[PDB]
Design a protein around this ligand. Sequence first.
Ligand SMILES: O=C(Nc1cncc2ccccc12)[C@]1(O)CCOc2ccc(Cl)cc21
Ligand SMILES: O=C(Nc1cncc2ccccc12)[C@]1(O)CCOc2ccc(Cl)cc21
Lengths: 305, 302
Amino acid sequence: SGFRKMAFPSGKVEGCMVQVTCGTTTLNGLWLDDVVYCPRHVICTSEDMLNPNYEDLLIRKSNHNFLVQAGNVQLRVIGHSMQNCVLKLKVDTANPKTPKYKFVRIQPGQTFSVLACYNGSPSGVYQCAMRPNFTIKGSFLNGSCGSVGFNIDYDCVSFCYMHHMELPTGVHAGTDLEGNFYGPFVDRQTAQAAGTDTTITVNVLAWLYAAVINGDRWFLNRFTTTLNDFNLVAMKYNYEPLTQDHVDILGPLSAQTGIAVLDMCASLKELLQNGMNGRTILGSALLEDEFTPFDVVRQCSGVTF
Amino acid sequence: SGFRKMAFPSGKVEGCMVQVTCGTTTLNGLWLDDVVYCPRHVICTSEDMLNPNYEDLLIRKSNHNFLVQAGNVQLRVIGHSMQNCVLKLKVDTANPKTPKYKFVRIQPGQTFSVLACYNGSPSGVYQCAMRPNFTIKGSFLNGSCGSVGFNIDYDCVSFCYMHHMELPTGVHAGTDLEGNFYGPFVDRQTAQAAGTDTTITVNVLAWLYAAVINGDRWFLNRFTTTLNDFNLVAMKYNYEPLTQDHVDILGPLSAQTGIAVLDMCASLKELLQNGMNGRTILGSALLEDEFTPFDVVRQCSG
Ligand SMILES: O=C(Nc1cncc2ccccc12)[C@]1(O)CCOc2ccc(Cl)cc21
Ligand SMILES: O=C(Nc1cncc2ccccc12)[C@]1(O)CCOc2ccc(Cl)cc21
């Protein structure tokens, strides 16, 4: 029993964290094979960050300008190239701790674990969701840039995020491991604002199934709804529309608990229109949306890595 | 900015997780140097359930009865001994991934990361607090026994918990790494009940300081209180009494935010009286008590 926000074991990723220094800027890099990946803004000064020409800045850099440190060993940079907003530093040594990995771009609503680092040293691991507005509600201080988001599939690390910046509202923006930002963000010191956030509906439903699996049933009701009627109500409360794909992925939980997806949707509909009435679900007074249907199955069935 | 429930990176602990099998029971062990630590209840059969005599059961076991598996390598048990509720299996190989470590017994309110394992394989990492009633509100299925709780301050792993059992209410009980249980619990299937849980008051205050550091100030008020008046109100909401030690540990946060401890205590009294009025503090509609004063400083200041 029990339900917790659970991150993937971070060991396979800790073996890849290195420190990258360029001039006065120090941030984190991901050392996979003979390449170190890090945000390209490591090459920026104060004037540069305001209106940067990264192609122009990188062309002026030499390999000896980048100081890469893996533990207490300096790695020698033998090449540099840029792929979108990520800088790729070719090193002479292949990381012997390189796990089986893949670079994956995730969709909003999907979850992943974040290994927060400072000076190439991992300090914390937390689980979070890629918000529908493409920000992550992370916990990052200055120096955390280059920290990565990942999932583990069997024994394969799927790298899906690299931290680049903090928006004025305290939320965070970053890119996939190919340098493409999630969201309408740019890596420059400029007025940027995250769009209005919405609730990840399929995740709330998955978390309601986790509550039923844990014996919390007070919110269940006799009612069912149509997917269209549910979406009309949910959109009114800033909830993401639920697609047929979401109903399908919720199938195993629906079969395990004996509560159809549209039956759980009628409970969610009532929870939205009437509130929780001083009651809690899994010790929470708010509907949780950072557990996907796969996360709930993985936790309530004990899948190991 | 931002505030999250954050676990320590689990890598240093993953390299120590092994699978221990005795008869039909399979659980997890912690392989440090040439010793594998695991709950002693791995030696229990269906008859040694309510009233097992572990000294008697262990004496009947031979080294070849314990099957230790580290990945796809069977480790050879060359000795066995019991220290309280933990079994120590001496193996013929020192774990090369053994980190710098220490065994630490924690107090209620202390937080730690849990590496939940099944069959010696880590499946997730989450963050816990030792509840004032000595249970932990974990997430564990059958087979999770032997999973460990830890803190990583600097290069050193402080092992503070080993999972042994699930109480009838879904909460969990375990021991430190010397086999001493936290709480009035025994490793028997006899009727056991956790005492009524209470909120870790010093941790809520630490979390309110984290919210102020993150710009959430709506709950602040012009009031201060005496420590005694605050404790009288808090106790009515099943909150732990706040001691002078707790006021002292909250000193740095009080200095950083400019809000005295007793001033924040008055804000906490008001929150207990009114509720949140549809507002959240750090994205939460309930007062969070699983962040210690030390966690808040580490996460907010660095
Ligand atoms: O956001 C940044 N860094 C941080 C990233 N995460 C969390 C933080 C928390 C506290 C301070 C800084 C943080 C910047 O390096 C600072 C200046 O503005 C930009 C603008 C664009 C870019 Cl791509 C980076 C940065
Ligand atoms: O609680 C146990 N195991 C579990 C431990 N964690 C989580 C679980 C979840 C679902 C079922 C079982 C769980 C026992 O091994 C069996 C039951 O009685 C006792 C009694 C005493 C002891 Cl020291 C262990 C156990």
